Amino acid sequence: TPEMPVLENRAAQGDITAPGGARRLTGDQTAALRDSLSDKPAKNIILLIGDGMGDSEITAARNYAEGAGGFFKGIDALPLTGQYTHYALNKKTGKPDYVTDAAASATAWSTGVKTYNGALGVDIHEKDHPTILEMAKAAGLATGNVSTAELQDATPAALVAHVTSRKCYGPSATSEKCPGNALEKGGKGSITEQLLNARADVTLGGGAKTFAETATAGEWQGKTLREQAQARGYQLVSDAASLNSVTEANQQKPLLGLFADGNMPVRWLGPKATYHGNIDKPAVTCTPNPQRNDSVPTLAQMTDKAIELLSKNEKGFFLQVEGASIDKQDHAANPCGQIGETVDLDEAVQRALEFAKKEGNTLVIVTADHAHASQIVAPDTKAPGLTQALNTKDGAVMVMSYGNSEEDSQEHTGSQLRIAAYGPHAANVVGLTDQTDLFYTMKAALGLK
Amino acid sequence: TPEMPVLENRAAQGDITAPGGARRLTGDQTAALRDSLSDKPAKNIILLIGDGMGDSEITAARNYAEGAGGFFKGIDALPLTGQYTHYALNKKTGKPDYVTDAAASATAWSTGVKTYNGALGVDIHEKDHPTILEMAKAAGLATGNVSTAELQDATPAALVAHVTSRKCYGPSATSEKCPGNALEKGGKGSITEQLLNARADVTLGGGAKTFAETATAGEWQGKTLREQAQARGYQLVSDAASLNSVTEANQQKPLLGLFADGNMPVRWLGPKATYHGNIDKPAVTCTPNPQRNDSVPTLAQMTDKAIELLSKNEKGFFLQVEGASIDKQDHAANPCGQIGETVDLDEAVQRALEFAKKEGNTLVIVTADHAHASQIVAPDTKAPGLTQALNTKDGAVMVMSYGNSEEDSQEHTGSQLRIAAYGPHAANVVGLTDQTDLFYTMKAALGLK
Numbered sequence: 052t053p054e055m056p057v058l059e060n061r062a063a064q065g066d067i068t069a070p071g072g073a074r075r076l077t078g079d080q081t082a083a084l085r086d087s088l089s090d091k092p093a094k095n096i097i098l099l100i101g102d103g104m105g106d107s108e109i110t111a112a113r114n115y116a117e118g119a120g121g122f123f124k125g126i127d128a129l130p131l132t133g134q135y136t137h138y139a140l141n142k143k144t145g146k147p148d149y150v151t152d153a154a155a156s157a158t159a160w161s162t163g164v165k166t167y168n169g170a171l172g173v174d175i176h177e178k179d180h181p182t183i184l185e186m187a188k189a190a191g192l193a194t195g196n197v198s199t200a201e202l203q204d205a206t207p208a209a210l211v212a213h214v215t216s217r218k219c220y221g222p223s224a225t226s227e228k229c230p231g232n233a234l235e236k237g238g239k240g241s242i243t244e245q246l247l248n249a250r251a252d253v254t255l256g257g258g259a260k261t262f263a264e265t266a267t268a269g270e271w272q273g274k275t276l277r278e279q280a281q282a283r284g285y286q287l288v289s290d291a292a293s294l295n296s297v298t299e300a301n302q303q304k305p306l307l308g309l310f311a312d313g314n315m316p317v318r319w320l321g322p323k324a325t326y327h328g329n330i331d332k333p334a335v336t337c338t339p340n341p342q343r344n345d346s347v348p349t350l351a352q353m354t355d356k357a358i359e360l361l362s363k364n365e366k367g368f369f370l371q372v373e374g375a376s377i378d379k380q381d382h383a384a385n386p387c388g389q390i391g392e393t394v395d396l397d398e399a400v401q402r403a404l405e406f407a408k409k410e411g412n413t414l415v416i417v418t419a420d421h422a423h424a425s426q427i428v429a430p431d432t433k434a435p436g437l438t439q440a441l442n443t444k445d446g447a448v449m450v451m452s453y454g455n456s457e458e459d460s461q462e463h464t465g466s467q468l469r470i471a472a473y474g475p476h477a478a479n480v481v482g483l484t485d486q487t488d489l490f491y492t493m494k495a496a497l498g499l500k
Numbered sequence: 501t502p503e504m505p506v507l508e509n510r511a512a513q514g515d516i517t518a519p520g521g522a523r524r525l526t527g528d529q530t531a532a533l534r535d536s537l538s539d540k541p542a543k544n545i546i547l548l549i550g551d552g553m554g555d556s557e558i559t560a561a562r563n564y565a566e567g568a569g570g571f572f573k574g575i576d577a578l579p580l581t582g583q584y585t586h587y588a589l590n591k592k593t594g595k596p597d598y599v600t601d602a603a604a605s606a607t608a609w610s611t612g613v614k615t616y617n618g619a620l621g622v623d624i625h626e627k628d629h630p631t632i633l634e635m636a637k638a639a640g641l642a643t644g645n646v647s648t649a650e651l652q653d654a655t656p657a658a659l660v661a662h663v664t665s666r667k668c669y670g671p672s673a674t675s676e677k678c679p680g681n682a683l684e685k686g687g688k689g690s691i692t693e694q695l696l697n698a699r700a701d702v703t704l705g706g707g708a709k710t711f712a713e714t715a716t717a718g719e720w721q722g723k724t725l726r727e728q729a730q731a732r733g734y735q736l737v738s739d740a741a742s743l744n745s746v747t748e749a750n751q752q753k754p755l756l757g758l759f760a761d762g763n764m765p766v767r768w769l770g771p772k773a774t775y776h777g778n779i780d781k782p783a784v785t786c787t788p789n790p791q792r793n794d795s796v797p798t799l800a801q802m803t804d805k806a807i808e809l810l811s812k813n814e815k816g817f818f819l820q821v822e823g824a825s826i827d828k829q830d831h832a833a834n835p836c837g838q839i840g841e842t843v844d845l846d847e848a849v850q851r852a853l854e855f856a857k858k859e860g861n862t863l864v865i866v867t868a869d870h871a872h873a874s875q876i877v878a879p880d881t882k883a884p885g886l887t888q889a890l891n892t893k894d895g896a897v898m899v900m901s902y903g904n905s906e907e908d909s910q911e912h913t914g915s916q917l918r919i920a921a922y923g924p925h926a927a928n929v930v931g932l933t934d935q936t937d938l939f940y941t942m943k944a945a946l947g948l949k
């Protein structure tokens with residue numbers, strides 16, 4: 052069919068010190084872009100969330116990994132781009148809370164309604180709203196939700212659970228934090244419980260431990276959430292090997308991948324940024340993480356199988372893939388960790404585009420939930436916060452900075468950030484939009500009511 | 501002719517607390533976007549540089565001025581969008597310097613070659629390269645260069661001067677800082693002298709004092725740079741009233757507007773951010789600047805007249821307009837002063853679009869040289885640097901942070917930033933591009949050799 056181009060090379064054209072050497076473009080876009088514009092309907096949609104992966108996160112990753120004139124074959128390759136707003140809401144006044152958390156933002160792009168920090172699937176009135184995933188499942192479409200964080204953490208949970216607070220993981224915490232939701236108290240239940248009820252075809256990530264809890268009320272009272280899964284049809288896999296033995300993954304044989312007690316281990320090791328570290332200490336070179344066992348699947352691997360299983364549905368599918376720890380390491384002021392994670396995601400995003408071009412009716416979207424702390428500063432910056440110099444692909448030093456908190460956790464920031472898309476309806480992310488528009492853009496491309 | 505739509509409303513559709521209330525989109529873009537793609541040649545081009553106005557600077561200003569669900573009629577209204585890279589070069593190794601200054605960046609978009617921080621119109625070998633303005637003048641097109649900074653400052657000087665350091669304002673400093681350029685030493689000369697030789701039709705800004713210097717060598721030796729200007733044909737205006745009396749402005753009657761000794765006064769007052777200021781001090785509300793005399797033209801006012809004068813050329817024109825102090829107040833950790841300047845810029849950008857739509861073959865581009873320091877943080881952020889909470893249009897507090905420097909000057913940052921465009925060839929800004937492409941995009945739109 053009329054193939055929509057996917058940016059093949061936005062890397063520098065040559066000698067960056069020479070005239071025309073640093074150009075990313077080779078010729079005029081007008082035609083190429085025009086060939087990317089389609090209001091055909093998406094058969095499927097894959098949405099890649101780089102948790103806290105704003106433009107600075109992207110630059111620092113490219114800069115370190117592929118060099119300043121380099122180019123991410125996935126993240127940088129989506130043709131249509133824009134910047135979106137992601138403000139949350141103050142619960143009491145319903146006023147904008149300029150800086151959102153994982154909870155409110157996820158709810159935003161999945162239900163189309165703004166909310167307060169810490170909420171999952173509810174508007175500020177605590178009223179429920181159906182998720183893009185739920186709507187899909189009803190339409191007969193296959194659903195998938197992948198992530199490197201515990202499956203209970205906001206971003207993935209936002210598509211299946213409806214709770215007043217995000218801390219309402221499983222049984223124990225919900226009873227004493229989300230009573231109105233508590234199963235025993237007559238509510239729908241904990242995030243975990245609600246996820247198992249949700250029943251999406253493919254659900255992979257960490258968070259094994261919240262499955263150790265036993266239900267209190269309900270049909271499965273007494274038994275651990277784990278057994279309830281199995282008992283209800285769920286195939287349980289815990290490693291690369293078992294993950295590959297799957298062939299079918301459908302409403303009767305849903306796949307539940309629990310690859311870590313909590314979050315999946317980080318891709319790279321590197322010390323954490325320190326006070327004056329860019330000046331008092333040697334420049335860092337990132338290293339692979341010894342701890343991460345070779346049996347723990349990688350985001351791209353997870354993304355790959357999901358796609359392979361999900362693609363079987365004649366109607367189509369929906370898949371959320373999250374590279375969660377970009378944000379986490381960003382909170383930890385740990386460059387190597389964070390950068391490596393963005394790389395991890397780029398890899399997954401590559402795997403998504405590859406399929407996007409072959410199939411031809413897919414919508415690929417890459418973006419973040421919000422902006423974060425890290426900033427690329429000058430080698431000699433003498434800062435008040437946490438810094439650290441890194442040796443980049445170019446053989447140059449690059450200095451990173453964390454200084455928007457004295458609390459030991461570096462904070463999110465409120466800046467608008469990038470949203471790139473490729474395929475049918477990819478046009479709706481261009482210019483300035485709001486994260487809730489993302490929701491509407493998925494519903495309409497997918498032709499959902 | 502086929503009119504290209506200019507984003508009329510990306511404000512929220514309604515109640516931000518309700519489902520679909522926070523949306524900026526009202527329908528599908530595909531067609532509207534289609535109707536914006538043209539490879540027709542631009543008759544003219546207007547380039548709006550918000551010095552240091554990256555996405556965080558845009559959000560903070562829209563948040564405070566128009567509210568989070570608000571929309572900038574100028575800045576936010578340009579249909580086509582993308583993110584570009586602006587790294588500079590190390591002079592010694594020709595390696596990437598991840599964080600450029602005003603000088604190198606300006607040089608990148610105007611000549612099309614990367615350079616080291618502090619250079620104006622030279623590559624790292626100190627070899628000269630023609631500017632887009634210079635090329636335009638030769639092509640027979642009208643030229644204009646507008647700024648709120650002293651005309652000598654990098655951003656506006658980059659289009660007419662070729663100096664080893666940006667500190668080579670006029671006579672004195674050049675002799676002792678850019679010997680190879682110094683007139684008497686045989687060189688082309690100081691930035692001022694080079695500007696006066698450049699002879700662009702319209703040149704308005706600040707920097708009156710560098711014109712008090714007297715040339716040393718040359719035809720006009722002994723006399724002050726100012727008399728030389730008059731002696732050569734320049735119409736010298738110094739206020740709104742004189743600026744409006746101009747009718748012609750061309751090669752024989754070139755206009756030179758010097759509206760301030762140095763930089764033009766800022767638009768808004770507001771105190772400077774302080775340590776723990778968001779917690780220790782009351783929330784601030786910006787105020788207009790009392791100092792700013794009513795006779796000092798405003799950026800939009802200046803942009804307006806430039807356009808009016810420049811529009812007279814049957815061939816076309818080229819116009820660089822810079823809102824300079826966004827960056828200057830940003831260095832100063834002064835939210836009210838910084839936001840005010842971004843607003844000041846939006847006003848001028850509106851002017852540009854207004855014309856852009858009427859004429860029909862204009863290319864408008866709005867962007868910044870680099871990213872800067874400010875960050876929108878949480879009301880209760882307990883930070884190491886400079887903070888300050890402000891009362892926004894929403895009636896909510898918005899906290900801003902400055903903490904990438906213990907030096908009393910807040911630093912630039914290397915993050916990739918937005919670049920929106922409207923008109924012929926506006927497509928070439930979509931996706932990831934590099935600041936030097938911007939140079940090639942102007943050259944081909946304007947059909948220059």
Ligand SMILES: [Mg+2]
Binds near residue numbers: 153200375
């Ligand atoms: Mg997450």
Ligand SMILES: [Mg+2]
Binds near residue numbers: 602649653654656822
């Ligand atoms: Mg400037």
Ligand SMILES: [Zn+2]
Binds near residue numbers: 103152153420421
């Ligand atoms: Zn997040």
Ligand SMILES: [Zn+2]
Binds near residue numbers: 103153379382463
């Ligand atoms: Zn976070």
Ligand SMILES: [Zn+2]
Binds near residue numbers: 827
């Ligand atoms: Zn600057």
Ligand SMILES: [Zn+2]
Binds near residue numbers: 552602827828831
């Ligand atoms: Zn600056």
